[PDB]
Amino acid sequence: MDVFMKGLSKAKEGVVAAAEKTKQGVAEAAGKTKEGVLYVGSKTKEGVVHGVATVAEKTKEQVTNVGGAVVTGVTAVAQKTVEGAGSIAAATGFVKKDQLGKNEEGAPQEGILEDMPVDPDNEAYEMPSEEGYQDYEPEA
């Protein structure tokens, strides 16, 4: 599924590039405007600061509520996905390969293989890596 991983990354890259482009365009327009300077906000700045402190306390309480909602979504999504996965496997009938009909076999043959068997097993007890080994002597 290397193609799926590549496609997933491609979409992520597009989203990042789009978000960055929009942010840059907005920042430029926000500073390009000279109306804000003429309008003046120094008086509102002090008012905004007091308002922000009040909002901050209100925001903190709301933030906690939002955090809980976010957790619920994560809990609800993970659980339903686990259940849906099981349902899919059940419908599939847990099959390694999808095939129809029976595999006909016949025409017996005999012969030998020039290439000896790989034999993954080393037929050796071998020592455990837990004991380890010494790379230095006590002398020095």
Swiss-Prot record:
Annotated segments matching region Disordered: 100-140
sequence repeat extents: 20-30, 31-41, 42-56, 57-67
Protein role: Neuronal protein that plays several roles in synaptic activity such as regulation of synaptic vesicle trafficking and subsequent neurotransmitter release. Participates as a monomer in synaptic vesicle exocytosis by enhancing vesicle priming, fusion and dilation of exocytotic fusion pores. Mechanistically, acts by increasing local Ca(2+) release from microdomains which is essential for the enhancement of ATP-induced exocytosis.
Example of a GO MF term: SNARE binding
Q: What is this protein called?
A: Alpha-synuclein
Q: SUPFAM superfamilies recorded for this chain?
A: Synuclein
Q: Which organism is it from?
A: Homo sapiens (Human)
Impact reported for H50A: Impairs copper-binding
Which positions carry Phosphoserine? S87, S129
Tell me the lineage of the source organism.
Eukaryota, Metazoa, Chordata, Craniata, Vertebrata
Location within or outside the cell = Cytoplasm; Membrane; Nucleus; Synapse
Region of interest called Interaction with SERF1A, as start-end residue ranges on this chain = 111-140
**Consequence recorded when altering A30P:** In PARK1; no effect on oligomerization
For biological process, the GO terms are: adult locomotory behavior; amyloid fibril formation; behavioral response to cocaine; cellular response to copper ion; cellular response to epinephrine stimulus; cellular response to fibroblast growth factor stimulus; cellular response to oxidative stress; chemical synaptic transmission
Domain remarks: The 'non A-beta component of Alzheimer disease amyloid plaque' domain (NAC domain) is involved in fibrils formation. The middle hydrophobic region forms the core of the filaments. The C-terminus may regulate aggregation and determine the diameter of the filaments.
GN (gene name)? SNCA
Q: Which disease is it linked to?
A: Genetic alterations of SNCA resulting in aberrant polymerization into fibrils, are associated with several neurodegenerative diseases (synucleinopathies). SNCA fibrillar aggregates represent the major non A-beta component of Alzheimer disease amyloid plaque, and a major component of Lewy body inclusions. They are also found within Lewy body (LB)-like intraneuronal inclusions, glial inclusions and axonal spheroids in neurodegeneration with brain iron accumulation type 1. Parkinson disease 1, autosomal dominant: A complex neurodegenerative disorder characterized by bradykinesia, resting tremor, muscular rigidity and postural instability. Additional features are characteristic postural abnormalities, dysautonomia, dystonic cramps, and dementia. The pathology of Parkinson disease involves the loss of dopaminergic neurons in the substantia nigra and the presence of Lewy bodies (intraneuronal accumulations of aggregated proteins), in surviving neurons in various areas of the brain.
- Residues binding Cu cation: D2, H50
* Similarity comment text for this entry: Belongs to the synuclein family.
Q: Which residues carry this modification: Phosphotyrosine?
A: Y125
Query: Which residues fall in a compositionally biased region of kind Acidic residues?
Result: 112-140
Q: How does it assemble?
A: Soluble monomer. Homotetramer. A dynamic intracellular population of tetramers and monomers coexists normally and the tetramer plays an essential role in maintaining homeostasis. Interacts with UCHL1. Interacts with phospholipase D and histones. Interacts (via N-terminus) with synphilin-1/SNCAIP; this interaction promotes formation of SNCA inclusions in the cytoplasm. Interacts with CALM1. Interacts with STXBP1; this interaction controls SNCA self-replicating aggregation. Interacts with SNARE components VAMP2 and SNAP25; these interactions allows SNARE complex assembly and integrity.
